[PDB]
Point group: C2
Amino acid sequence: MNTVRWNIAVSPDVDQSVRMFIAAQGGGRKGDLSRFIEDAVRAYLFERAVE
Amino acid sequence: MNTVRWNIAVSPDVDQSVRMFIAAQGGGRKGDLSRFIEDAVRAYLFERAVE
């Protein structure tokens, strides 16, 4: 019941692309960038889970 | 020419799944977890880029 603190370094090209995706889909979502990657990793881990 | 510092919080269930994927594919890779998500976001941003 406690969120974990993730620390990762990436190229500034990745951050700009992340904001670009939301800007095309809106620009004022509730969650933040942390949620965008969190849901992305969940879908990949599950897909490889089946096989 | 300077890596960016990413700060994101996720459920401890995501970290365990990340290490599980590499353990099944090996267990001693060069890069670290930061590279696993970096390449994941690059593939998604490009796919939506075409359309």
